[PDB]
Amino acid sequence: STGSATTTPIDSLDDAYITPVQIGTPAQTLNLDFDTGSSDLWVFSSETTASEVDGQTIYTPSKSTTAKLLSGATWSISYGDGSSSSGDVYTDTVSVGGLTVTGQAVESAKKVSSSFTEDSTIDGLLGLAFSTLNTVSPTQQKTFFDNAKASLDSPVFTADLGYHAPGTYNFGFIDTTAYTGSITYTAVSTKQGFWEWTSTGYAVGSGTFKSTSIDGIADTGTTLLYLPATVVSAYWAQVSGAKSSSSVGGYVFPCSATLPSFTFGVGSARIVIPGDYIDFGPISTGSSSCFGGIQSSAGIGINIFGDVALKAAFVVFNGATTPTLGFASK
């Protein structure tokens, strides 16, 4: 089997991408944030505290003839950005782009933090990291990909995120028309539960490539590119007037600037992020100070190849017995 679904930016900055997901019988379609940095499939639901729902589409398990309460199971998650959610668990039929999993754990939110309430466009998350990170207790549950992978033609999924445009998540096959050149594969460590890999270096604009190992995670659920402070300083030094602002929370730059590209290494291959992908617009409406898309990881504890980096590439998440990551230009 295979599946293919279009993923769409939630706003004009590509802050996140939503993909339609069919849950239950008859189908209830919710727009979920596919997140390769986490491993819970959770949804706004008929059980969510009413004051914490503001425009989202909800899953109502009582209206699904295939929903079954997973007795005794609870879940609770906190994300790297400080947001969180928690609730109970149903199993139900879940389909993405024509690919169907029966008995998928669907984590129904009873509580969500304010940042979720305030984003009416995201109806929940679909985690695509390794199932060892799933938060369901007392019996940990499998991700959608883990449940589907034995049935897939090939045990892979691909992320092809658009710049200011829709893109595609595919399951079970590699669309050879979706990228240019070849795909360069690189080793993955699953020891922390993430798609963790080591970049071979970077360049700023037309500058020389610096060979240096940068360990980090491929994370579709994070907007920006978070890298070591040395690397980030070298980038922003090439933008006149750019500075790190403690009050804003990162590097800002004059909105009148033209940004240089940023290149990262994948083995001997190179992925180029155009300068325009690094512009996240005014810090507040009407400001001439703009927020940068490359930021320091120094306060995180891990480097994160988020959407800014991933949308410059066609990315293969190879879930074979020994997982690997693949990157191609497009």
UniProtKB/Swiss-Prot annotation:
EC number: 3.4.23.22
Domain Peptidase A1 stretches: 17-328
UniProt-listed GO biological process terms: proteolysis
Reaction(s) catalysed by this chain's protein: Hydrolysis of proteins with specificity similar to that of pepsin A, prefers hydrophobic residues at P1 and P1', but does not cleave 14-Ala-|-Leu-15 in the B chain of insulin or Z-Glu-Tyr. Clots milk
MF annotations from Gene Ontology: aspartic-type endopeptidase activity
Cystine bridges: 255-290
Protein keywords: Aspartyl protease, Disulfide bond, Hydrolase, Protease, Signal, Zymogen
Catalytic site: 35, 199
Domain of life: Eukaryota
Recorded family membership: Belongs to the peptidase A1 family.
Protein name, as recorded: Endothiapepsin
Protein species of origin: Cryphonectria parasitica
Section covered of the full-length record: 90 to 419 of 419
